[PDB]
Amino acid sequence: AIAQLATEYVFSDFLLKEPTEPKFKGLRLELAVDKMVTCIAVGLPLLLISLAFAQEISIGTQISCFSPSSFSWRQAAFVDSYCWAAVQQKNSLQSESGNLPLWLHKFFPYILLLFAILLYLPPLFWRFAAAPHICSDLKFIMEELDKVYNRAIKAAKSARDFKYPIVEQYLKTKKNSNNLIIKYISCRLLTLIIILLACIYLGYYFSLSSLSDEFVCSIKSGILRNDSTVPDQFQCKLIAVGIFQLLSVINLVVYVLLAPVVVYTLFVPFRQKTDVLKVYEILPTFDVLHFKSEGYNDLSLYNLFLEENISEVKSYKCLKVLENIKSSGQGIDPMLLLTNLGMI
Amino acid sequence: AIAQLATEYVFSDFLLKEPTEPKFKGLRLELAVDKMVTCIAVGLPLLLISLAFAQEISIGTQISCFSPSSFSWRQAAFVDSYCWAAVQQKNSLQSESGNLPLWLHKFFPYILLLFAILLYLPPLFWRFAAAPHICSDLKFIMEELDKVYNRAIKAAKSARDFKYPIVEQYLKTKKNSNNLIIKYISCRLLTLIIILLACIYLGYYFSLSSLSDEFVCSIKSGILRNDSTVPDQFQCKLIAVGIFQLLSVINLVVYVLLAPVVVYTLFVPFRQKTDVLKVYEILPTFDVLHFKSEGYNDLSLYNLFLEENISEVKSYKCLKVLENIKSSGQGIDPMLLLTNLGMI
Amino acid sequence: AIAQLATEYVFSDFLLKEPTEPKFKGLRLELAVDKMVTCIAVGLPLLLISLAFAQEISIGTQISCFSPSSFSWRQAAFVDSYCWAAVQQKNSLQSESGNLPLWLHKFFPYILLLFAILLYLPPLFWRFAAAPHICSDLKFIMEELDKVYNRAIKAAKSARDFKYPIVEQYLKTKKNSNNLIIKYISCRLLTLIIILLACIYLGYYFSLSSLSDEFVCSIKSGILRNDSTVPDQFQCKLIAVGIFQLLSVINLVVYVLLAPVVVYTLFVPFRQKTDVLKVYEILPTFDVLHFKSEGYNDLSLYNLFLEENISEVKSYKCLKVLENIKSSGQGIDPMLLLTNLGMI
Amino acid sequence: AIAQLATEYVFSDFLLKEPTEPKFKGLRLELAVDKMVTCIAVGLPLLLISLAFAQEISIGTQISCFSPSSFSWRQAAFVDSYCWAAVQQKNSLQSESGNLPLWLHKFFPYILLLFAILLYLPPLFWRFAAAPHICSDLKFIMEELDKVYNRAIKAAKSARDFKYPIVEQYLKTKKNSNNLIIKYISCRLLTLIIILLACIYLGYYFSLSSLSDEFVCSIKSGILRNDSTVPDQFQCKLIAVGIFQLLSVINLVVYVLLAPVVVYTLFVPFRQKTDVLKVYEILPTFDVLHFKSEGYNDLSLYNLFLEENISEVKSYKCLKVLENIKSSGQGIDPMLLLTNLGMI
Ligand SMILES: CC(C)CCC[C@@H](C)[C@H]1CC[C@H]2[C@@H]3CC=C4C[C@@H](O)CC[C@]4(C)[C@H]3CC[C@]12C
Numbered sequence A, B, C, D: 001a002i003a004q005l006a007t008e009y010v011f012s013d014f015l016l017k018e019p020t021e022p023k024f025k026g027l028r029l030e031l032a033v034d035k036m037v038t039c040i041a042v043g044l045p046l047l048l049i050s051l052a053f054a055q056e057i058s059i060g061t062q063i064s065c066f067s068p069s070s071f072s073w074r075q076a077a078f079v080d081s082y083c084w085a086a087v088q089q090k091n092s093l094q095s096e097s098g099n100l101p102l103w104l105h106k107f108f109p110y111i112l113l114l115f116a117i118l119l120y121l122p123p124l125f126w127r128f129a130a131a132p133h134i135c136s137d138l139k140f141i142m143e144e145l146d147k148v149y150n151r152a153i154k155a156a157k158s159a160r161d162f163k164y165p166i167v168e169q170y171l172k173t174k175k176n177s178n179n180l181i182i183k184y185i186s187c188r189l190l191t192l193i194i195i196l197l198a199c200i201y202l203g204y205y206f207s208l209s210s211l212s213d214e215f216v217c218s219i220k221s222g223i224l225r226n227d228s229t230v231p232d233q234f235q236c237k238l239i240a241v242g243i244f245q246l247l248s249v250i251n252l253v254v255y256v257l258l259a260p261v262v263v264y265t266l267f268v269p270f271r272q273k274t275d276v277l278k279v280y281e282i283l284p285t286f287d288v289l290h291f292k293s294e295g296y297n298d299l300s301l302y303n304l305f306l307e308e309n310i311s312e313v314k315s316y317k318c319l320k321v322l323e324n325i326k327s328s329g330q331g332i333d334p335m336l337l338l339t340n341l342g343m344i
């Protein structure tokens, strides 16, 4: 039913499932905006496919040819099925709009499924190629941040009663390499191109005259070519073509609204803001150097992933509340850190 | 069946599922009134869609055109399907009420699903954008309250046998920022606007003459335009239109009753009452300062979320019972706190 | 099938599911009588809806109009569907009993579902508004009782080898407030009113002549108004109306039997008997004062909830067996308590 | 399918599910004979309902009226559905056996479901009212038996290298109260009465002439009353009536065989034999006094429940093997108990 389809595709965790494995425990591995874009671009065409053939919206068979009254039920069924299979056969049918509109009307669900698959492909390539590496690197970075926070609080407590910036060096090295950012931009660009092509196709499909679904059909090949009792042609109409056009314009609207989001996603350096690591600069055990901005490198992408999935880090949360309290400046950062006692 | 739909949509945890993740363990992340509003506004139109096409209420096909007796079964089926697809084609049909009523009668399930999706969108935006931040902040606040309660009871026990207000400073800082409250008000306002538009549409749909479902249909395009055996027109009726109107007025009543709730929700500062933190003011380790009221800021929203999901805090429950006992004034707050022995 | 519906709605845990959350572990949060009343009042109309359209009891379509023999199958189907949709349209049909009986016959499942939803609403309001508070308070009370029992047995063992009545003070304070009892009485009263209205409706529906299901139908609007081959009217009958009346009288009987139960529930103070706390009065560490009776206050409701869900408390069970043994008076209460050794 | 129904209702744990809660861990809370009686009396009529309308045994529709050849398919369908709905309407039909046989033939599944529900009601009342109390009491009794066994074995080991009969006093007190036994006897008696009424109904249904399923039907009310082309009456037959009678006699046989079991159950004191507590009399720490027999009191019912669900007690099992070995008398009870070393 329509409501069942809605529950499956919008109100359920459709493509929102976290990786089912212990390797990525709590790691999104995909930005929220990218996940939203993929979920829409994939589950919208599927939802429209399901809707267009819902038991309520669908009168019945997808084509009716209006055989003569003399024709029996199965003769008329032969006519309808023959014309359905003959939309491909150009000789059999003669339609003013041509044969491409008939092909599109017959295979619209296939085309929507193709677009959905093509849009799901780049996210899958990301999750299967560049996701494990960033997952491992980000897990190491979070562990290093937790360890340095613990060491700093232990030092503060000892004072009240190595020291090498490994994480900073690793981030600096990431500043050079750009394979991950190149893959990310390539997959986003392919998604954008697929969306644009889908918009072109949907606009063309919705621009039809709405009468191209009606085509003339001739069961006059073979032994029936010179038969007399059979009329030379029939009036066939492809039902649900109006529904297809409505859903196609809906998908076109959604995709044109979505494309600016993908374009904004492509410009990762601009998105790289609100320095996540700036909060850690007040730790004595952490060097006061952010050095993450203004670069078409994997460093900006790692900064984005950190700003996305750093809320799970207790040390980061503690430092963030310390920073927020520092806005008033009533107290002192080391005193607040010592009082917090948030090692684990 | 009707009962199955009821069990799925009203008697089950439809959209009442808690976040399936360890990050939010026991945190609602959504006020009870907001959750009720979203659940109604989403699962009502879906329930009505399912009901309108239930196997019992539905006589059968959604349109019957009453072809002549001479017409065969599949000729009549062609007529019915053609008219179903031709509700869009204005030339084919001539109805007194126009063609918009026919469009609405055909696509009412789609319109209800659209309203449900549009009403579910703002809650989803909230849960995916502003929910993680408030979850982390509120978890930190609850942990700080538990820790300060434990410290105060330990101090009392030591007396019987830092001290910095970090949580108060954090709340004071939240008094300034307003991004969360702005997002909350924006999503509530969008929900209200969607509800009002849905009410307008449902009132218009229910105001129809009830005879607009009957339209005249002409299969007279193409080779059949000059055919003689076919009548110039047919009498088609869209079945289930009365059911659609009944369910639409039901949804209109529900939404007009719900809109005052959304308006009351928009006025969060008025809702900010029954100070949750007032109970903690009797703790020696906690400063006697509430400072949370009369502000279009995130502080009021945080106060609401606390008053919602603070019952899970053992320290808060203990302080609440101490406060309630203090109404008589027979005993002493520190003595009762020491006797309680409710560290964990 | 009928047996499947029975298993789902009477032999299964339909609305008998305990709260699926760790917050309420073993707490009913709903009295047994109230749960029985809600389960009946909700799952009876749903069961009757399912039964009335069971594949065995149902001959087939819900209306047959007996078109002339000259009419084709789909002409007759058009007639039947038109009349089904025209039960609303007063002009189309002319029935002796009127049009309200036809509306009721068509929408009886909707009306039963409406009554079920309206009866499920007050229980849901209770469980979502007043259940968390009573759950927290009752959990605290049980924990306090366990702690005082442990302290008393420890004192007795020490003798053989604070002391403040916090729980008693909390109960005394609950004696004043009445918001929970007011909500309980309001929800019970609304349930009673809904049940009475349902009884009125079912009595009216069952009082019909049983021939109102037969109505005269006229497909004579539009181009067919002046058509000659079509008869001026048809004889239509709404099938399953007898089944609807039978099930409606069954529901009426059940609801009239149930209403006295709801009225008895409304009088909570009378139900407040068999003092649960009287057993704890023999503990040296517990003050000898019950002070819970004869009040339209939340104290009586809390006493009811205690008498309901106190069997899970080992200390209460031990004190109950001590009390029962004290009926003979052969031994001594402190000696029996010491011998029991039931700390945990 | 038939085999699926069999698997669900006889070969599966239909109504044999243990209470899904930690409160009753391993406690039957229902005697084996009572559970068997309830399972049969409930799942037999449901199984017969399912069988009577199985896709294999069922030819098709439940009534066929044999309309004239001139009648079209949907005219005949109208006739059949009209007569199906008119079995209630006495004026419409004229049958030699009357109208009650037709009512019974139409609503036999409803009557079987009613009997199943009425037979399931007393067991449900028991499980929801008197089951928690007996569960708590019996758990306490088993814990006391385990503790006294442990104390006795510890004393024996100490000798080789309070003392109050709390459980005996509790059982003696149970000797007085009779509310549980009264409820048990009342529910068993209601089950017996329901079974007898079901037997009466099934005997009456099976005693029919087998031709009462054939009734004369007249679609001659309304505009068709004076119509000429329609015959004055039709020959309608209610299919599956023979299957209903066969299954009804099967259920009658099962219920008459079952009723003696219920009568034997009612006489609980006679069932109270094979003293379970007699084995514990050899323990030095346990007083040598059974005092459980010859009483219409809850003590006999508790003895039955003990004899039912005491096999789970390791101490009871050890004492039972000691008793069995004592039949030969080769050894000594205290020596065997010391050698067993079965504390836990
Ligand atoms: C997904 C991508 C590939 C879709 C590409 C656009 C498709 C949908 C449409 C839009 C415009 C279309 C073209 C419009 C006009 C003509 C001229 C005609 O004589 C042959 C077909 C041809 C050449 C069409 C082929 C298909 C076409 C290119």
Ligand SMILES: CC(C)CCC[C@@H](C)[C@H]1CC[C@H]2[C@@H]3CC=C4C[C@@H](O)CC[C@]4(C)[C@H]3CC[C@]12C
Pocket (backbone or CB within 6 Å): A196, A199, A200, A203, A204, A207, A256
């Ligand atoms: C992503 C955005 C830009 C998509 C917007 C949809 C645009 C591309 C659509 C809307 C209407 C469409 C046109 C409608 C009709 C025709 C005439 C046909 O003989 C060739 C294709 C052509 C010229 C279409 C090309 C694509 C088109 C211009």
Ligand SMILES: CC(C)CCC[C@@H](C)[C@H]1CC[C@H]2[C@@H]3CC=C4C[C@@H](O)CC[C@]4(C)[C@H]3CC[C@]12C
Pocket (backbone or CB within 6 Å): B197, B198, B200, B201, B204
């Ligand atoms: C969800 C929102 C967009 C719904 C907006 C209201 C819709 C349902 C209805 C209510 C009143 C309607 C209008 C009423 C009157 C007219 C004048 C007519 O000559 C053209 C259509 C037009 C202009 C209608 C368009 C659709 C309309 C605006």
Ligand SMILES: CC(C)CCC[C@@H](C)[C@H]1CC[C@H]2[C@@H]3CC=C4C[C@@H](O)CC[C@]4(C)[C@H]3CC[C@]12C
Pocket (backbone or CB within 6 Å): B196, B199, B200, B203, B204, B207, B256
């Ligand atoms: C949220 C609340 C205010 C909704 C209440 C429903 C209101 C808006 C509905 C109920 C009846 C409706 C009117 C019914 C009939 C017409 C005539 C038509 O030619 C234009 C629209 C118009 C004028 C409708 C406008 C909207 C309307 C006034």
Ligand SMILES: CC(C)CCC[C@@H](C)[C@H]1CC[C@H]2[C@@H]3CC=C4C[C@@H](O)CC[C@]4(C)[C@H]3CC[C@]12C
Pocket (backbone or CB within 6 Å): C197, C198, C200, C201, C204
């Ligand atoms: C659930 C509640 C609202 C149901 C209320 C009772 C319903 C079922 C029935 C019972 C008696 C009925 C009334 C009986 C008589 C008349 C007089 C007639 O000229 C108009 C309808 C009217 C006024 C009926 C309206 C509907 C009615 C009130």
Ligand SMILES: CC(C)CCC[C@@H](C)[C@H]1CC[C@H]2[C@@H]3CC=C4C[C@@H](O)CC[C@]4(C)[C@H]3CC[C@]12C
Pocket (backbone or CB within 6 Å): C196, C199, C200, C203, C204, C207, C256
């Ligand atoms: C909860 C209890 C009291 C419900 C008992 C059912 C009662 C209320 C039912 C049973 C028969 C019913 C009556 C049957 C017939 C008519 C005639 C009609 O023109 C007006 C309604 C009226 C007068 C009904 C009113 C309600 C009624 C009296």
Ligand SMILES: CC(C)CCC[C@@H](C)[C@H]1CC[C@H]2[C@@H]3CC=C4C[C@@H](O)CC[C@]4(C)[C@H]3CC[C@]12C
Pocket (backbone or CB within 6 Å): D197, D198, D200, D201, D204
């Ligand atoms: C479950 C219980 C209520 C069933 C009771 C027995 C039912 C099945 C049957 C068995 C015998 C039957 C009775 C036999 C004879 C007559 C005399 C006739 O002129 C009216 C019906 C009446 C009075 C029957 C009513 C229904 C009846 C009582």
Ligand SMILES: CC(C)CCC[C@@H](C)[C@H]1CC[C@H]2[C@@H]3CC=C4C[C@@H](O)CC[C@]4(C)[C@H]3CC[C@]12C
Pocket (backbone or CB within 6 Å): D196, D199, D200, D203, D204, D207, D256
């Ligand atoms: C539990 C045991 C005793 C049930 C045995 C079934 C008995 C009660 C059945 C079997 C045959 C039945 C009888 C068959 C026929 C008739 C004639 C009818 O006009 C009145 C009922 C009457 C007289 C039935 C009464 C009940 C009956 C005697």
Ligand SMILES: *[C@@H]1O[C@H](CO)[C@@H](O)[C@H](O)[C@H]1NC(C)=O
Pocket (backbone or CB within 6 Å): A222, A223, A224, A225, A226
């Ligand atoms: C049909 O008859 C025509 C007559 O002109 C002939 O040319 C043609 O070959 C025939 N077709 C078949 C399939 O026999």
Ligand SMILES: *[C@@H]1O[C@H](CO)[C@@H](O)[C@H](O)[C@H]1NC(C)=O
Pocket (backbone or CB within 6 Å): B222, B223, B224, B225, B226
């Ligand atoms: C139908 O016949 C008419 C006669 O006036 C002619 O004008 C029209 O073109 C014909 N239509 C078709 C589709 O051949």
Ligand SMILES: *[C@@H]1O[C@H](CO)[C@@H](O)[C@H](O)[C@H]1NC(C)=O
Pocket (backbone or CB within 6 Å): C222, C223, C224, C225, C226
């Ligand atoms: C039907 O014919 C009658 C003849 O009196 C006329 O009044 C009426 O307008 C016609 N109806 C239609 C819909 O053409």
Ligand SMILES: *[C@@H]1O[C@H](CO)[C@@H](O)[C@H](O)[C@H]1NC(C)=O
Pocket (backbone or CB within 6 Å): D222, D223, D224, D225, D226
């Ligand atoms: C049918 O015709 C008879 C002729 O005697 C008449 O008495 C009766 O009222 C008519 N019935 C209807 C429903 O018009």
